[PDB]
Amino acid sequence: MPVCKNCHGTEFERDLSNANNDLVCKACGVVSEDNPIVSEVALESREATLNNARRKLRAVSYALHIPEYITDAAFQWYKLALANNFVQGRRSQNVIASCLYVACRKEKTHHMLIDFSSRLQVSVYSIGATFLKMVKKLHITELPLADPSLFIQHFAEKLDLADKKIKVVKDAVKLAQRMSKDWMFEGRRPAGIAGACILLACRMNNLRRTHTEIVAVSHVAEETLQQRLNEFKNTKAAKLSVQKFRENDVEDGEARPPSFVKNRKKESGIVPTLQNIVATVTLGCRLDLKTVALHARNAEYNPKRFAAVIMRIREPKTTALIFASGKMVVTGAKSEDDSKLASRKYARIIQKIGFAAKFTDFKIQNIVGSCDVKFPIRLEGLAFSHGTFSSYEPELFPGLIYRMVKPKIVLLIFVSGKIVLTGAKQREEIYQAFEAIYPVLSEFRKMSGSPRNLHLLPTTDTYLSKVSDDPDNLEDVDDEELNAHLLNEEASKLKERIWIGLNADFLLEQESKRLKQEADIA
Amino acid sequence: LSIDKVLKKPNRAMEYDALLSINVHSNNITSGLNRAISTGNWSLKRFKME
Amino acid sequence: SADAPNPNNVNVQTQYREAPVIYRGPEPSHIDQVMMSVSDNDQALIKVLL
DNA sequence: CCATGGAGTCATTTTATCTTGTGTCACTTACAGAAAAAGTATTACTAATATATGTTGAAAA
Ligand SMILES: [Zn+2]
User: CB-based burial of residue A403 (10 Å sphere; 0-12 exposed, 13-18 middle, 19+ buried)?
Assistant: First the structure.
């Protein structure tokens, strides 16, 4: 880094031969450092919590027999997730859990989320939930895609038996590999298909090991095991090659995972479909959910369970929702012609029975849609490519999660190619995203076509206009069946008699604490 | 102690053996013993003599 | 590496500081048996004997 | 005015204490809990999907 004060030399050799330890450059001869001086031999809220995280960290660390390495690897991840304050209010285990998890995931080792929970009584969902959430609140790479080819190692460890298993290992490995190739690996919980491979190669090596004995380490269901098994029995060249020579046949034949096979069971140019549309409407006035709960055909009210009232209808088969403050959510609407229509109709009970409750602030909170491309999709490389915009977790849920910001919609993906799409307030955004991503679909295929026009049907505001936007037009759009959806006074007398009949314990402690309000000053 | 942090918070009915935490809690007996026999500093507080 | 990693790497983990260990001795010697193995915590372990 | 009693000062021991103890290589390995704040998990809804899971049981051998 320094320079010879004479030759202006750019490179130095230390000289360790004669125990001078010189430092001199080939073109100068002038030293630079002679005499190589060489050495020898509290209370904070955040830092304390970091120490505690170390302790709960070490604790769970060796318990799974993980590297001393990977722990201090993941401890940093905890320190990172603290910055976005994701870790503040959620059960500490679920945090330290995934924070420890993604690390040994990136290193590509054998550890497993289902395996990871049983340190607790908890569900391999709560942990999975928190995990997948800290995937949102951080931004994480694609790399942690596990295969059975890793897990079959450690699963083989507790199988007892003898040296033959190593043989079985290679017997299993190339098996599972072809199984990944034969195309009926995708979208499944890996540990299961791993155990299936082990049962196969073990039987291939002619031993007797029971299914229970397999799932003990495999941590899957017997039924699942033999279901994935019998799924293997009918596969390509399964019968013909099942004898000796192991497999020298790498030939794939055809590829037919049960995903679209069931599409045959019930058996661009295809338009995405509208399942449901969620909206909101404000009535501008607060009412008594108890009082409204008295006369309705579709009602249920249990603040002990949920603080609001159920509202529904038979046609156009919509639920929506109602609040206490006088606002509401809109559900069950397959289109907009049904929504503002129904949205107004649910106010006809009220303006017929309850308060003034006009129709205000009507906006779609979300739109649901789904469709199918009618051909298989390989997700394992999809996210491995697009996981910047995508995520794929075999364990939780079968399909792939896709994140599109432009426009902003999450795309739910499967093996068969059936695609569910929502997280959109606008019908056009659907065909936008579906359109733009469909070339990615055509990109990943194994061996309609024409988008036609990007926008065909009328816009959303057209169908919003097909229903009266004026908050005071109701009796005109009243189905006249809601005139029959009012129950008589006696049905409210004895029906309320039943409601309070069961609710006198809930309102009991309710009004009792209302008395404790007096007890406050005392 | 580690048996208690289960039993502070009455989460449903708490049993779930509480056992499998022992592996979590182990190697104080192993690593503590290795480090001892390798280094050769025996810390005995029970006799208060090291 | 010893620095604080982040969820950002475009390409390089690359740059290396090579710190080879040298045999400083008064007399020439020979390398005979050189072992490659890995300890229980799974990290590369190299042991050579002169 | 004088012998006395009482105390005040002043040597004198004997107890309580601390610094040391030949040199050189050659490796070696601040407590805990309390309260406030932040944030979240249910707690309902469709609504599509596709595994797991259990059971069971029905149906077949
Ligand atoms: Zn120089």
Answer: middle
